[PDB]
C-alpha cells in the first residue's frame, strides 16, 4: 500500500525511487518489472480509488498497532506479572479464554499448561491416548527458546510459574504494578531453561 501511494504508475516508478519502503534489494526487481510487464495502464479515476484503498489499509494497520499498544497498557496495568512472564497478548488470550482473571487464577497450573488445546485434550482422554503438552502457552517466547522435548518440559515449568504470578496478580491487594513477582519467576524459568539446554543426550 505504501509503495503504490508513493509511485502510482510504472513510468512514475521509472522516474522515482524509494528507500523507506522495500529495503535496498527489491528495488532492481521492481524496476525491471516496471520496465517489462504484462500489465496494462490504469486511468486517474480508478487510480484514485486504488490510492484511497491503499491509505485505508495503511491507516488500518496504524489502528492495529495502536490497539496493540492499548492491549499492552491495560494488560500491564491489570495482570502485570503475567506480562513479565509470558507476555502481553499471550496472557491476554489466556484471560480471555478462561473468562475472568480470578477464574483463571483459581485454576491449577496443569490447566494453564493445556489451556488452549481442549479438543485434542478431551479426544485424547475419551480415547486412551496421549494428551497434548502445549496448549495456548506454546507461543510464549521461552517455549520458543526451547527446542525438543524440553519445550514440553518448560511449558510445564512456565505454566507453574505463570499460575504463581497470575494468582498473585488476581489475589493481591498490596500489589504495585511493577513486575517483581513475574520478574523473579521469569528468572527462575530462564535459568531452568539454561540448565536443561546445557545438557546434551550425546556422549562426548
Amino acid at each position: 500500500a505504501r509503495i503504490i501511494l508513493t509511485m502510482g504508475i510504472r513510468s512514475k516508478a521509472s522516474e522515482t525511487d524509494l528507500s523507506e519502503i522495500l529495503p535496498e534489494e527489491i528495488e532492481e526487481r521492481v524496476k525491471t518489472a516496471a520496465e517489462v510487464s504484462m500489465g496494462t495502464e490504469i486511468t486517474q479515476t480508478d487510480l484514485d480509488n486504488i490510492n484511497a484503498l491503499a491509505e485505508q489499509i495503511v491507516e488500518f494497520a496504524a489502528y492495529r498497532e495502536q490497539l496493540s499498544n492499548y492491549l499492552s497498557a491495560r494488560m500491564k496495568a491489570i495482570a502485570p506479572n503475567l506480562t513479565q512472564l509470558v507476555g502481553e497478548l499471550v496472557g491476554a488470550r489466556l484471560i480471555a479464554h478462561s473468562g475472568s482473571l480470578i477464574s483463571l487464577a483459581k485454576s491449577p497450573a496443569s490447566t494453564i499448561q493445556i489451556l488452549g488445546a481442549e479438543k485434542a485434550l478431551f479426544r485424547a482422554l475419551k480415547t486412551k491416548h496421549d494428551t497434548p503438552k502445549y496448549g495456548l502457552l506454546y507461543h510464549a517466547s521461552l517455549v520458543g527458546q526451547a527446542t525438543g522435548k524440553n519445550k514440553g518440559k518448560i511449558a510445564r515449568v512456565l505454566a507453574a510459574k505463570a499460575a504463581v504470578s497470575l494468582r498473585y496478580d488476581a489475589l493481591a491487594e498490596d500489589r504495585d504494578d511493577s513486575g517483581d513477582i513475574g520478574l523473579e519467576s521469569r528468572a527462575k524459568v530462564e535459568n531452568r531453561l539454561s540448565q536443561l539446554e546445557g545438557r546434551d543426550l550425546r556422549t562426548t
Binding site: 520496465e35 517489462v36 486511468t43 480509488n49 484511497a52 484503498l53 485505508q56 495502536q66
Partner: protein, 369 residues
C-alpha cells in the same frame, strides 16, 4: 551463398554473419538436420556481428507491428545500413537471409543491392538461432528474452484487439465485492463502538441509530457538553442534551481508545460512498443501459453474481437471477435486462438510449397491471 542473417526478436534486431554454408543438396539428411540442434556445430555456421536493442516497450510494440505486417521500420533501416556492405544493384547483390517472404520486398524497396532469401535453408538457419537464442548473443543484451516476450505478446494482443481499460468490468466486480466486505466491516466496527459507549450512556444508540451519525457525534462529545448548537448534524439533539443532563451510565485511556475506534469507523464510512460514487460512475461508463434499466448498484451486483459483463451477456434470458403479476414482472425485467446487457457488452462505446427505451417498456408493462 546466404551471407548475412537477420533475426528479429523482442529485445531488438540482430544481424548475424554466416561463416560456413550448410549443405543445399544434403539439407534433408539426418546429420544436417541435427547439426542445428547441436550447439557445438551451429556456432561453426553462425556468428553475431550486430545487435541493436530497442528503446523500450513502445518501440518494441512499434517494431512488432511493423515486422508483423511486413514493413521495414526505421531501426531496421539503421541496422541494415550499418551492417550490410554497399554491394551492386545489378551484379552480385549482398544476400540477406530473412524468415518472411513478404518482408523481403520491403527490404529491397529500401536497399536495392540486397536480395533476400527465405527458403528452407534460411528457415532452418533462423530456427537454429531461435533454438539457441541467449547463447549466441554472448551476453550483450539487457533484459531476459522470455520476459520481454511475455510483455511484447501481451502488448501486441491488447493492441490488436483494442483492449480498453475504461470498459473493464473487473473494476466493478472488485468494487462491489469490496463494498460488501466493508458493509459488514463498518457494521461490526460501529456495533463494537456502540457497545463500548453503551456504558457512557445507553441512549445515543436509541436516539441516533445510524452508525456513521452516532460515530461522528461521539467523536466530539466525550463529556457533558449545554451549547447544543453544532450537534444537529434539532429535536434529537435537544433530547440528547437532555439525556446528557440525565446521564445514567459510567475513563481516560479507554475513552481515548474508543475515540480512535470511532475515528476508524468514520474513515471507513467516508471511504464507503466514495467507493459507491466511483462504482456508479464506472457503471455508467461500463454498463449504461443496465444502470438506466435497474440502477447502478443493482446492475453491479448482477454482473458480479454473473461473474462478468460477458457472462451476463451470453447467459440466456430465462436464466437471469434479478433481485402472479409480481411474479412475471420479474421475468419481463429479466429478459429486458438480459437484452440490455447484451447491447451494453457488445457495443463498443455504448449510449444510454436503449436502456431508456427498455426502461420505458418495463414501466409501460408494470403500469398496465
Amino acid at each position: 551463398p546466404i551471407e548475412y542473417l537477420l533475426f528479429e526478436e523482442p529485445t531488438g534486431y540482430a544481424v548475424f554473419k554466416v561463416k560456413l554454408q550448410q549443405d543445399d543438396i544434403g539439407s534433408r539428411l539426418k546429420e544436417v538436420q541435427e547439426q542445428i540442434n547441436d550447439f557445438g556445430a551451429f556456432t561453426k555456421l553462425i556468428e553475431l556481428v550486430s545487435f541493436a536493442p530497442f528503446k523500450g516497450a513502445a518501440e518494441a510494440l512499434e517494431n512488432a507491428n511493423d515486422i508483423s505486417e511486413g514493413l521495414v521500420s526505421e531501426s531496421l533501416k539503421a541496422i541494415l545500413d550499418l551492417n550490410l556492405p554497399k554491394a551492386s544493384s545489378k551484379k552480385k547483390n549482398i544476400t540477406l537471409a530473412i524468415s518472411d517472404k513478404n518482408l523481403g520486398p520491403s527490404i529491397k524497396e529500401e536497399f536495392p543491392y540486397v536480395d533476400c532469401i527465405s527458403n528452407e535453408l534460411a528457415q532452418d538457419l533462423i530456427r537454429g538461432v531461435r533454438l539457441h537464442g541467449e547463447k549466441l548473443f554472448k551476453g550483450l543484451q539487457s533484459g531476459d528474452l522470455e520476459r520481454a516476450q511475455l510483455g511484447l505478446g501481451h502488448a501486441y494482443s491488447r493492441a490488436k484487439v483494442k483492449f480498453s481499460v475504461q470498459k473493464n468490468d473487473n473494476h466493478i466486480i472488485q468494487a462491489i465485492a469490496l463494498l460488501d466486505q466493508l458493509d459488514k466491516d463498518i457494521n461490526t466496527f460501529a456495533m463494537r463502538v456502540k457497545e463500548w459507549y453503551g456504558w457512557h450512556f445507553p441512549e445515543l444508540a436509541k436516539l441516533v441509530p445510524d452508525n456513521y451519525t452516532f460515530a461522528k457525534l461521539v467523536l466530539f462529545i466525550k463529556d457533558k457538553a449545554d451549547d447544543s448548537l453544532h450537534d444537529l448534524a434539532n429535536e434529537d439533539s435537544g433530547i440528547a442534551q437532555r439525556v446528557i443532563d440525565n446521564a445514567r451510565i459510567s475513563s481516560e485511556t479507554d475513552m481515548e481508545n474508543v475515540c480512535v475506534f470511532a475515528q476508524r469507523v468514520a474513515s471507513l464510512a467516508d471511504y464507503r460512498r466514495q467507493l459507491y460514487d466511483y462504482l456508479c460512475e464506472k457503471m455508467h461508463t461500463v454498463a449504461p443501459n443496465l444502470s438506466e434499466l435497474i440502477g447502478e448498484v443493482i446492475g453491479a451486483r448482477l454482473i458480479s453474481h454473473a461473474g462478468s459483463l460477458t457472462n451476463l451477456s451470453k447467459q440466456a434470458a430465462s436464466t437471469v437471477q434479478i433481485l402472479k403479476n409480481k411474479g412475471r414482472i420479474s421475468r419481463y425485467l429479466a429478459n429486458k435486462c438480459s437484452m440490455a446487457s447484451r447491447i451494453d457488452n457488445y457495443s463498443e462505446e455504448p449510449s444510454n438510449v436503449f436502456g431508456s427505451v427498455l426502461k420505458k417498456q418495463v414501466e409501460q408493462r408494470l403500469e398496465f397491471y
